Amino acid sequence: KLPPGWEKAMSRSSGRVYYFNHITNASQWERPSEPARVRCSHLLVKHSQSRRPSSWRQEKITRTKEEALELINGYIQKIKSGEEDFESLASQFSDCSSAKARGDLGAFSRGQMQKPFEDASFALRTGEMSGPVFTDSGIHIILRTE
Template structure:
């Protein structure tokens, strides 16, 4: 038998996990040798393969899971990012970029994840814009209000905060 930490087991585990909805891991039971599925948010497990993204089990009124694409401008509270040390674009130019990205996503020319990875001025770009779950009070108020108003799978209109202009995608 293979050790649980062997390279082959890790590679197989990674391949199996990629087919699962967000927030789930496939694991093998030590006692039965059968696969089971772990909700990485709640640490609860189940035998049946999940069909929906993991949730915290709490009311969606309490927590949301979102991704975002941030475009900073010269009036942002910190006009600097991993992409550009000194951001000089105007708020109007930032809005034009955000509207263009939204159009590409809505029209199907690009995915949210592709654009967030390439163009977001937030370090979450390395996670395709994924911010994970958060509750009320964790984000700037305009961002929080927009995120909690979205339905799962819905993309926001441009949202203005002190950080810049955002597109928010509610993922769970």
């Protein structure tokens, strides 16, 4: 049947079936198997098209949205490989002062965050991580902690 937002796909490189979630942009080999509030951390990479292209990391953010997506993709690879963990990359690289809390946003309900961020967060299971999620703020990786 599959939980909210999951579809079956075929790997372009290997032909093996995998699963993709169009709400969270998550993808995984394994077959996948609502609350008032969720708790999430995030790692935001901002770009020249961000509504406010500035962070505690740098006053003027100049990277292209394409460059921002490559950075996000690289961080996701490191997190999934276990070379680095989410908290460590969030502390170092998130373009939001929540970096100082290892990316933790705290708990929130529907109606509080931008819709793509909200929809991804509510469709993650506890412990699950999103793929790249685009909002007006920039591109996010979202980790649902509660």
